[PDB]
Ligand binder design. Structure first.
Ligand SMILES: COc1cc2ncnc3c2cc1OCCOCCOCCOc1cc(F)c(Cl)cc1N3
Length: 287
């Protein structure tokens, strides 16, 4: 395909390590096009059957949405190194932790809109994410986040999975809606760990008995009810992503009534001069 570039070992180098998961290790790298002197920053994930890999990979490189990250290139040899575009701000989970007092309700609600927009695109393409979490939402600019780690799931998180995924390994677009709720909960708690102190082996036990994540202190009841319907036992009773896009888009038009944060009227707001400046330098895709 013309979308997944197959790279040689000799045309890219790992430079600095950025993080790891229980799947692979993410490096900041450099691509040196053959015959050129430039060095282009890329992100590289070295994972811990080659045809199966390439096939799932083509499926990945076929995502064309402003809020979904595209797999750009691959190098199948010693280890499976995956190449995508570098996001200098990092993952959305770390971003809300380092800035846990200077994030206003306009940003948080718009992030919820965009993640749902990206998830809705995955459902239209009939692709199940399987690993949605704040750690797997990247920040391109503060005004533009993107969902990442799409396919790595099958190519290779108890507290984010739905009960039916935990009990029966059933992953559907509605179990992704459960995962979306936990991702939204994480953002409204500024990066708190869900079920902190609870062993992962016991989560399905507490889920069956009716307990859910408690109400974050900044959430009104309108926002918390959306998160609670995402955790209904009946998977067909959970909201659809298209319904979530509409609901968070409404609340983003009056952020102060649905989120109570201290100084929200003193926090930075996306400026047109600022949004145009970010676009010309870091974010030229369509939107
Ligand atoms: C500025 O720092 C970063 C820039 C990045 N640019 C692009 N992609 C990244 C980046 C990760 C960074 O580090 C922050 C913390 O690490 C994040 C650990 O979990 C998120 C991993 O999600 C991925 C999945 C993948 F398949 C591929 Cl290929 C790449 C990434 N991650």
């Amino acid at each position: 395909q013309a979308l997944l570039r197959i790279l040689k070992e000799t045309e890219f180098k790992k430079i600095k390590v950025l993080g790891s998961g229980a799947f692979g290790t993410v490096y900041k790298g450099l691509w040196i096009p053959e015959g050129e002197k430039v060095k282009i920053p890329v992100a590289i994930k070295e994972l811990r059957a080659n045809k199966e890999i390439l096939d799932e990979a083509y499926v990945m490189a076929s995502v064309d949405n402003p809020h979904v990250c595209r797999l750009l290139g691959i190098c199948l040899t010693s280890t499976v190194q995956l190449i995508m575009q570098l996001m200098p701000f990092g993952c959305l989970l770390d971003y809300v932790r380092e800035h846990k007092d200077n994030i206003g309700s306009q940003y948080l609600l718009n992030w919820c809109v965009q993640i749902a927009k990206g998830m809705n695109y995955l459902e239209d393409r009939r692709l199940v994410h399987r690993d949605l979490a704040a750690r797997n939402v990247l920040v391109k600019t503060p005004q533009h986040v993107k969902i990442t780690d799409f396919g790595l799931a099958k190519l290779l998180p108890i507290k984010w999975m739905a009960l039916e995924s935990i009990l029966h390994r059933i992953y559907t677009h509605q179990s992704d809606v459960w995962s979306y709720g936990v991702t939204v909960w994480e953002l409204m708690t500024f990066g708190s760990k869900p079920y902190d102190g609870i062993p992962a082996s016991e989560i399905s036990s507490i889920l069956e008995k009716g307990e859910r994540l408690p109400q974050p202190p900044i959430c009104t009841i309108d926002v918390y009810m959306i998160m609670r319907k995402c955790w209904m036992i009946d998977a067909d009773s959970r909201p659809k992503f298209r319904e979530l896009i509409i609901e968070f888009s409404k609340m983003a038009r009056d952020p102060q009534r649905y989120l109570v944060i201290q100084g929200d009227e003193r926090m930075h707001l996306p400026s047109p001069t600022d949004s145009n400046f970010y676009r010309a330098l870091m974010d030229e895709e369509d939107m």
